[PDB]
Amino acid sequence: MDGLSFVDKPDGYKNEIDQLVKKEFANIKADNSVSTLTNALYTEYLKQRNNKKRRTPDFNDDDDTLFLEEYRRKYPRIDTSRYIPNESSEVSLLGIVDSYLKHQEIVLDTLLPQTVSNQWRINNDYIRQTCTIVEEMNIQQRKQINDLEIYRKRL
Amino acid sequence: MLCAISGKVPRRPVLSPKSRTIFEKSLLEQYVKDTGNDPITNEPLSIEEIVEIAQQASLTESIPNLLTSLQNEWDAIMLENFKLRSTLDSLTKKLSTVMYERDAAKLVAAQLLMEKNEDSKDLPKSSQ
Amino acid sequence: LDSLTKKLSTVMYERDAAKLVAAQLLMEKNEDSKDLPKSSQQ
Amino acid sequence: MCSTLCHHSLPALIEGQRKYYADYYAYRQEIRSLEGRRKRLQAMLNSS
């Protein structure tokens, strides 16, 4: 488990260890009908066609275009009424929503900092641990080398 | 400011008293009837337990609402969840490659733990 | 999706962390060989 | 990354004691060889 990141100051060693890990891997080796049509639409990459009729039409048609004509009138009157209540308020309704979006945005970036601080704070605690033990390991190795030659010089 | 189920910006937000989290009324009311518990914390919660607590500028070119806008909404719902199902499938596959490579490393360490200390032991014995 | 990503992230981090155990271990094992070999020779 | 560094803290903190304790016992054995090798040298003066 133990491998000191802060204390151990190559890419060759990653490439080396990857090969040894690789060799040990060589050894081991809820919705209704809605979901059916939605998954089929996405898989096939084709959206279902809508009513491309109101836009084109034609004068001196028949009973069919008499309907299609009368459709264009009522929707154009609804359109012109739908543009009236927008222009009445105008830009006040738009800029009121623009202000809401600024309150929504700043909240996210506050959380970006809260995460930033606690993430650096955890790493900060790790750092001290790394330097604590890395010294202790240094102490151990020095003592190790002392015996190694001490035992020889006695013999 | 958002709902904690769909990812909406709620029109009638309602907060639960067991876990302080704001949901849109329709979506929290649906969960309680499906299974009577809080979705996040899995704690007992009912419809009576809930406590009830926005402007969108309709575009200038607002026919399109029936045809173009509604079409885009069910395209965007369709191709996202399909792509999201694709993302979930790969995470489980990449999970299996993670755990296998992990256990492969465990065996290396275990194999090397026997190797190193016995090599060190042999140096201690050599002196004699 | 995100709950599996936590497992993915914790693994990949811990994998390459555990990978550095080997790199260290291998070089020490190697050091034990030449040491003993050069000593046992003489 | 927060949950990473959170996890990395918990698994590392336990591995260190095990790292040290191994080397600690490794050191104890090394001391014994040191502790005896002297005595044989010390007994060279007894024969003299």
Curated annotation (Swiss-Prot), chain A:
GO CC field: Prp19 complex; U2-type catalytic step 1 spliceosome
Superkingdom field: Eukaryota
The name on file for this protein is Pre-mRNA-splicing factor SNT309
State its location(s).
Answer: Nucleus
What's the stated role of this polypeptide?
Involved in pre-mRNA splicing by stabilizing the NTC (or PRP19-associated complex). As a component of the NTC complex, associates to the spliceosome to mediate conformational rearrangement or to stabilize the structure of the spliceosome after U4 snRNA dissociation, which leads to spliceosome maturation.
Q: Which GO terms describe its biological process?
A: mRNA splicing, via spliceosome
Other remarks on this protein? Present with 721 molecules/cell in log phase SD medium.
According to the record's subunit comment, the protein's assembly and interactions are:
Belongs to the NTC complex (or PRP19-associated complex), composed of at least CEF1, CLF1, ISY1, NTC20, SNT309, SYF1, SYF2, and PRP19.
Keywords noted in UniProt:
mRNA processing, mRNA splicing, Nucleus, Spliceosome
Tell me where it mainly resides. Answer: nucleus
Curated annotation (Swiss-Prot), chain B:
Q: Give the species.
A: Saccharomyces cerevisiae (strain ATCC 204508 / S288c)
Gene name?
PRP19
Q: Where in the cell is it found?
A: Nucleus
Record's protein name: Pre-mRNA-processing factor 19
Q: Which parts of this chain are annotated as the region Interaction with CEF1?
A: 63-120
Q: What does this protein do?
A: Probable ubiquitin-protein ligase involved in pre-mRNA splicing. Acts as a central component of the NTC complex (or PRP19-associated complex) that associates to the spliceosome to mediate conformational rearrangement or to stabilize the structure of the spliceosome after U4 snRNA dissociation, which leads to spliceosome maturation. It is also probably involved in DNA repair.
State the similarity comment. Answer: Belongs to the WD repeat PRP19 family.
U-box domain: residues covered: 1-62
UniProt subunit comment:
Homotetramer. Component of the NTC complex (or PRP19-associated complex), composed of at least CEF1, CLF1, ISY1, NTC20, SNT309, SYF1, SYF2, and PRP19.
Q: Which intervals of the chain are annotated as region Required for self-association?
A: 54-128
Could you share any additional remarks the record makes about this protein? Present with 11700 molecules/cell in log phase SD medium.
Top-level division of the source organism's lineage: Eukaryota
From Swiss-Prot, chain C:
Per UniProt, subcellular location reads as:
Nucleus
Quaternary context: Homotetramer. Component of the NTC complex (or PRP19-associated complex), composed of at least CEF1, CLF1, ISY1, NTC20, SNT309, SYF1, SYF2, and PRP19.
Q: What else is known?
A: Present with 11700 molecules/cell in log phase SD medium. The tetramer is an elongated particle consisting of four globular WD40 domains held together by a central stalk.
- Give the family per the record: Belongs to the WD repeat PRP19 family.
Q: Any idea what job this protein has?
A: Probable ubiquitin-protein ligase involved in pre-mRNA splicing. Acts as a central component of the NTC complex (or PRP19-associated complex) that associates to the spliceosome to mediate conformational rearrangement or to stabilize the structure of the spliceosome after U4 snRNA dissociation, which leads to spliceosome maturation. It is also probably involved in DNA repair.
Provide the protein name: Pre-mRNA-processing factor 19
Q: Which gene encodes it?
A: PRP19
Included stretch of the parent chain: 102 to 143 of 503
From Swiss-Prot, chain D:
At the top level, the lineage of the source is Eukaryota
Which compartments is it annotated to reside in?
A: Cytoplasm; Nucleus
Q: How does it assemble?
A: Belongs to the NTC complex (or PRP19-associated complex), composed of at least CEF1, CLF1, ISY1, NTC20, SNT309, SYF1, SYF2, and PRP19.
Write out the similarity annotation.
Belongs to the CEF1 family.
* Record's function text: Involved in pre-mRNA splicing and cell cycle control. Required for the binding of the NTC complex (or PRP19-associated complex) components to the spliceosome to mediate conformational rearrangement or to stabilize the structure of the spliceosome after U4 snRNA dissociation, which leads to spliceosome maturation. Its absence leads to an arrest of the cell cycle, possibly due to the inefficient splicing of TUB1.
Miscellaneous remark of the record: Present with 784 molecules/cell in log phase SD medium.
Q: What is this protein called?
A: Pre-mRNA-splicing factor CEF1
List the gene name.
CEF1
* From-to range in the entire protein, with total length: 540 to 587 of 590
